[PDB]
Structures are given as structure tokens and as C-alpha cells.
């Protein structure tokens, strides 16, 4: 008889799943599918840290966990999760041509990877008589609608986006959070049926599995943590993003729902709905941009902008990105990536990236600034790539948008507002608790130098059992001069961008790069 297939990619959850719902109705049997793409999941010995070439082992373990939770939640309703390994496009059509499937459902998505897959699968299904339901539930708004309504392009600013965006449909909507039951799986036919694969099966040695980010994945954890994240009504009511403490690691200054919203473990519509409820239950609460709900709106802003901008994930070809002659220097990038820059604050943060796969927004700010238009002047696409595989909440739209923001390549252009690798952390942690924790090599350094070990008298060092240049590196660069040179180049780069009416050529750029080379080398 007529069967259905619920294809899972990002909505790794049972609650608020418009796609899963439809797949359960009018079907005597249902096929829940998820494909492990070797290219993204399997071990890559060439990578700079355990994982594939696109994902650190941390985000991978998170996904695998989300998958187990999901299957489990399905095995509860009498269903199950069928996991195949291979190129999704191939796997999917081979599933269609193998099963009596008349209806194919999967949550919509705007990432390039998925836009590409969905054209193929859609065309195959359409040409083979399979119905296709691809509802928008990963975001509160439909990028295409916003862009269409706004004329022909995406609103140029948060403020402008909210005006146009209006309010999400899920507002007065009633979401489906549970199901009494779910259609039985149905003939598995002849396909390599598989259970969620272990890190080992993905090719990872045990030493590559020693560390553990402190955040389990899955819808279960998701919902549980949301409950904890917003239990304090006053806190959520008085929420102001800029006022959070970036050094607070024992108790993160924000929700950390980031990874669950990225893999769809948590519906953002439900979250948005909860916030709404507790907002009306008080009377006085913060509003965007700084509000907690205002944060779900930043996600919306970048997604819409990302979906409407070709070459969004790169400078060249990007309508909205300022053309800047960034340097390239695997040695400098490496020093920053592994957290060996010399500035304890920056290094401590980069280590939290590697160990937690998450850092407070402001921390992400500092290291992104230091790496680009703040001190090193390395291409933002480079910090972007490092972040993309290390963050357990790595999100295409969000990550690219933010790196362009922190590099003053787009959205924000007050490049003379530079974070200080030395003094910023003090504003919150003068004792340097955060640093000591993630950089135990400086465990004993006296607070008078914790943010600048290179200024600690040689005697203090040896006693603190930390010698700059041996145990802990010395400043890879001197902030003052560095940031002053960045502010300089940044100036002439903007000058060129303005002179060429936002259309700098491959030529001009090259000539600027040369020009700056002279004025800053001889």
C-alpha cells in the first residue's frame, strides 16, 4: 500500500515536526531515515584535531547522540530510525526505488549543501510520482518570504529585518509535541539496514575519544535543558546579551541551547513560544535586540541574509562583503587555532573551543577580532573554517554571518572598536579564573601577570613554574602596533571599496595588497 518516508537531516526531534506529522498520517507504514555522509563523518588523519575535514570529533559525537535519542524516541512509538551510510542523494533514491513510498517528507533547509540535495531529490520524486512535503520548521520565518516581501533582497539590518519579518506564524499556532503512536516501519526490502554508528566505526581511535564536551546531544537533553535554562522567570525576563560574563564557565552566562537549535534537537518555534508565555506572565521584560527572544531573532536575521546572498560563505563574489587584502600565514593561523598566541585570554578561549566546542558570545568576539581586523589580519574565512569544525553548534548561516561581522567585512563597520587581548578579560575576571582553568600551565601565575605572563619578572615565572618562551609562548604579536597597523590597512581597504562603489576588482585588490606591502614592510 501507500507508504511514507520521513527524511531526517536537521529536525532531529519528534516534537514540533510538521514533516513527521504528515508522514504518520494516511500511511499504513512509515520509513524514518537518516544518512551518514562519510565525507563529513569519517576520520581524517590530515585534520589538525580528531574528526573529519569538516567536523571535529566533538560535534560528531553530539550528532551520533542526537541520532540515538531520536531512534530511541521512535522505538518508543513503535517506530525506529534507519541509518544508511553514503551520499544522501544516492541513498534516498535507492530507498524510493526500493520501497512502496508514495509520500516523502523532510524538514526544509537553506544551507547550500541541502539546497543542492533537495533539488535532486525533489526532481526525482516529482518525476516518479512521489509526493513531497518540505515544511519550514527549522526557523521561525521563511527566508524567501521575507526577501520577496522586502522587495527583492534581504533586509540590510536586524532592525529592518524585524520590521519586515513581523511575527512568526507559530505565534498563535498550536504545535504538535507528541504522538500516541507511529506507523510501523514497513518492509525494509534489500538495503544495508543499519543502527547508529559508533565513533569507532567511523574510524576513530580511542585516544581520539578521550575528551568529552560537557553537552550531551538529542531532543531529550534539549527539552530538559530548556527547562533548566528558563526556569528562573526573572532572569529570562531581565535578559540582556551584552551584559553576560564571557569568563563564566562553571555556570555559562547564557542558555547554551545553541547546539540543540543547530541540529534541530529543539524546535525554535517551541522555544520562541515558551519565551512568549513567560513574557506575558511577568509584565516587564527586555526586548530585542538584547532580549533572549531577541537572540532567536539574530538566528533568523543571518539565515535570511545568508539565504539571499550568493557566495555568502566567502569574500570573493559576495555582494555584501567588503573586499579586503587579508594575509595568509599557516604559522599565524596555527598559533591562533591551537591557542599558542601568547595572550592567556585568547589562548584560554581557543582552548575552550577545542574542549567544549562552545564559548560565550563575547569570547567568540575577542578571538575572532584578534584573528582578523584586530591584530593578526588573517582571512576571516580561516577563522570561519576553524570554527566550523570545532564548534559543536557550527551553523553555516550563523557562523559565516558572524565572522563577516567581527571582521568588519559586513553588517558592522566601526573597525576602530577593537577588543584588547590583554584588558578585556580583566573586566570580568581580574583574578584570571577562566585562564587558569583552561590554561593550567599558568595555574600558579600571580594575578598581577595572568593576562600578560611576558611582563612577569623572570623570578616570578620560575616560581610560578611557567617560563614564557618555554612552557608558555610569548606574545606572537604586540597588540598596540598590530591593531594600529590593522586599523591602517582596514582604512585604505575601505577607501578602495568606497572609490569603486562596492565593486572592487580582482585587479585593484591585488594592487592594494602590493601597495600595503610596501608601506608596511619598507
Name which of 8 and 302 has its Cβ closer to ligand FAD.
302
Quick check: 40 and 388 in contact, CB under 8 A?
A: no
Q: Is 293 in the site for ligand FAD (CB under 6 A)?
A: no
What is the total count of residues that contact ligand FAD (CB under 6 A)? 28
What are the binding residues for FAD? 241, 254-258, 295-299, 358-361, 364, 393-395, 399
Rounded distance between C-alpha atoms, residue 95 and residue 350, angstroms: 42
**Residues of span 256-285 touching ligand FAD by CB under 6 A:** 256-258, 261-262
Minimum distance between the CB of residue 421 and ligand FAD, rounded to whole angstroms?
15
6 binds ligand FAD (CB under 6 A): no
Q: What is the Cα–Cα distance from 161 to 146, expressed in whole angstroms?
A: 8
**Binding residues for ligand FAD restricted to 220-249, rule: CB under 6 A:** 241
Q: How far is the CB of 416 from ligand FAD (least distance, A)?
A: 18
Q: With binding defined as CB under 6 A, does residue 438 bind ligand FAD?
A: no
Grid cell at residue 72 = 530511541
CA 271 – CA 279 distance, rounded (Å): 12
| 241 vs 244: CA distance, rounded Å | 6
Binding-site residue positions for phosphate:
240
Burial of 462 (0-12, 13-18, 19+ CB in 10 A): exposed
Answer yes or no whether residue 354 interacts with ligand FAD by CB under 6 A.
Answer: no
> Pick from 41, 70, 296, 442: which binds ligand FAD (CB under 6 A)?
296
The residues facing 104 across adjacent strands are: 5, 132
With CB under 6 A as the contact rule, the residue among 302, 326, 336, 415 that binds ligand FAD is 302
**What is the full DSSP assignment across 443-496?**
TT--TTTTT-GGGS-HHHHHHHT--BTTTB---SS-HHHHHHHHHHHHHHHHHH
Q: How far apart are CA 14 and CA 271, in angstroms?
A: 15
CB of 67 to ligand FAD, least distance (A): 19
The site map against ligand FAD for 381-410 (x = CB under 6 A) is ------x---x-xxx--xx--xx--x----
Q: Is 299 in the site for ligand FAD (CB under 6 A)?
A: yes
Rounded CA gap, 398 and 353, in Å?
16
- Least Å from the CB of residue 84 to ligand FAD: 27
- Site membership for ligand FAD, residue 103 (CB under 6 A): no
User: Angle at CA 460, nearest 5°, toward 458 and 462?
Assistant: 70
Q: Which residues bind to ligand FAD, rule: CB under 6 A?
A: 241, 254-258, 261-262, 295-296, 298-299, 302, 360-361, 364-365, 368, 387, 391, 393-395, 398-399, 402-403, 406
Amino acid at each position: 500500500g501507500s507508504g511514507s518516508l520521513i527524511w531526517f537531516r536537521k529536525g532531529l526531534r519528534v516534537h514540533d515536526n510538521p514533516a513527521l506529522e504528515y508522514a504518520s498520517k494516511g500511511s499504513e507504514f512509515m520509513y524514518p531515515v537518516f544518512v551518514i555522509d562519510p565525507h563529513y563523518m569519517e576520520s581524517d588523519p590530515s585534520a589538525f584535531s580528531p574528526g573529519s575535514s569538516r567536523a571535529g570529533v566533538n560535534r560528531i559525537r553530539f550528532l551520533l547522540e542526537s541520532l540515538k535519542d531520536l531512534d530511541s524516541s521512535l522505538k518508543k512509538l513503535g517506530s525506529r530510525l534507519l541509518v544508511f551510510k553514503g551520499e544522501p542523494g544516492e541513498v534516498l533514491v535507492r530507498c524510493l526505488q526500493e520501497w512502496k513510498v508514495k509520500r516523502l517528507c523532510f524538514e526544509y533547509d537553506t544551507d547550500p549543501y541541502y539546497q543542492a540535495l533537495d533539488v535532486k531529490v525533489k526532481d526525482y520524486a516529482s518525476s516518479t510520482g512521489v509526493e513531497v512535503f518540505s515544511p519550514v520548521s527549522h526557523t521561525l520565518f521563511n527566508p524567501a518570504h521575507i526577501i520577496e516581501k522586502n522587495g527583492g533582497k534581504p533586509p540590510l539590518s536586524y532592525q529592518s529585518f524585524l520590521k519586515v519579518a513581523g511575527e512568526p506564524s507559530c505565534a498563535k499556532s498550536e504545535l504538535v509535541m507528541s504522538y500516541s503512536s507511529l506507523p510501523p516501519i514497513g518492509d525494509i526490502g534489500n538495503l544495508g539496514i543499519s543502527e547508529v554508528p559508533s565513533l569507532e566505526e567511523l574510524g576513530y581511535k580511542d585516544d581520539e575519544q578521550a575528551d568529552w564536551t560537557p553537552f550531551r546531544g538529542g531532543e531529550s537533553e534539549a527539552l530538559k535543558r530548556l527547562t533548566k535554562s528558563i526556569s528562573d522567570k526573572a532572569w529570562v525576563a531581565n535578559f540582556e546579551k551584552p551584559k553576560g560574563d564571557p569568563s563564566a564557565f562553571l555556570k555559562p552566562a547564557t542558555t547554551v541551547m545553541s547546539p540543540y537549535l543547530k541540529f534541530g534537537c529543539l524546535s525554535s518555534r517551541y522555544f520562541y513560544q515558551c519565551l512568549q508565555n513567560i513574557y506575558k506572565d511577568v509584565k516587564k521584560h527586555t526586548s530585542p535586540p538584547v532580549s533572549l527572544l531577541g537572540q532567536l531573532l539574530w538566528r533568523e536575521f543571518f539565515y535570511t541574509t545568508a539565504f539571499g546572498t550568493p557566495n555568502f560563505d566567502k569574500m570573493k563574489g559576495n555582494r555584501i562583503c567588503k573586499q579586503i587584502p587579508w594575509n595568509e600565514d599557516h604559522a599565524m593561523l596555527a598559533a591562533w587555532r591551537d591557542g599558542k598566541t601568547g595572550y592567556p585570554w585568547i589562548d584560554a578561549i581557543m582552548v575552550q573551543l577545542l574542549k567544549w566546542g562552545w564559548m560565550h558570545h563575547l569570547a567568540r568576539h575577542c578571538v575572532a577580532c584578534f584573528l582578523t581586523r584586530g591584530d593578526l589580519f588573517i582571512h576571516w574565512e580561516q577563522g570561519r573554517d576553524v570554527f566550523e569544525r570545532l564548534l559543536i553548534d557550527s551553523d553555516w548561516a550563523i557562523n559565516n554571518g558572524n565572522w563577516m561581522w567581527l571582521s568588519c567585512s559586513s553588517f558592522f563597520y566601526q573597525f576602530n572598536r577593537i577588543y584588547s587581548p590583554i584588558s578585556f578579560g580583566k573586566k570580568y575576571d581580574p583574578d584570571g579564573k577562566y585562564i587558569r582553568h583552561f590554561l593550567p600551565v599558568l595555574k600558579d601565575m600571580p594575578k598581577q601577570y595572568i593576562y600578560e605572563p611576558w611582563t612577569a619578572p623572570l623570578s616570578v615565572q620560575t616560581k610560578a613554574n611557567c617560563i614564557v618562551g618555554k612552557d608558555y609562548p610569548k606574545p606572537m604579536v604586540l597588540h598596540d602596533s598590530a591593531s594600529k597597523e590593522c586599523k591602517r590597512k582596514m582604512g585604505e581597504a575601505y577607501a578602495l571599496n568606497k572609490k569603486m562603489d562596492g565593486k572592487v576588482d580582482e585587479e585593484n585588490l591585488r594592487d592594494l595588497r602590493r601597495k600595503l606591502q610596501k608601506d608596511e614592510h619598507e
